[PDB]
């Protein structure tokens, strides 16, 4: 069938450059592990205002002073 794929590329080498890019953009988002970083960054941007919850007993974490040890690590990006 490869003789076909070289005998449409002697006549219409145009749309073939579209298909060649048509796929290869569909396939790859399920591959490279850089993705799913993309979903973590985009969730953490505080559009809104954080509202402090009520602490009686627990209070699992997150003390009054924010810079004290509180919660997750978002600074894996700052070094990135």
């Amino acid at each position: 069938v490869a003789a076909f794929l070289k005998n449409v590329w002697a006549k219409e080498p145009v749309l073939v450059a579209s298909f060649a890019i048509a796929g290869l953009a569909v396939i790859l988002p399920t591959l490279s592990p850089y993705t799913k970083y993309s979903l973590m960054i985009n969730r953490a941007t505080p559009y809104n205002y954080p509202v402090p919850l009520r602490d009686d007993g627990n209070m699992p974490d997150v003390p009054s002073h924010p810079q004290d040890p509180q919660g997750p690590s978002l600074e894996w990006l700052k070094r990135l």
Binding site: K6, N7, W9, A10, E12, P13, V14, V16, A17
Partner: protein
């Protein structure tokens, strides 16, 4: 006698047909001349500057 023009056949082998598919789709021709043979403007113009200068004749 004779001659025959525009009588030729494409070669039809994958060493060639890239060379004709590196042409349609990458524009490797059509920039050959008018990317170039046009410029090629760097030659001195040819003008007889008229009210003063004038051109040749014969007796």
């Amino acid at each position: 006698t004779y001659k025959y023009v525009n009588l030729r056949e494409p070669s039809m082998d994958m060493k060639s047909v890239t060379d004709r598919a590196a042409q349609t789709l990458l524009w490797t021709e059509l920039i050959r001349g008018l990317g170039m043979t046009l410029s090629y403007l760097f030659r001195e113009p040819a003008t007889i500057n008229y009210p003063f200068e004038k051109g040749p004749l014969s007796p």
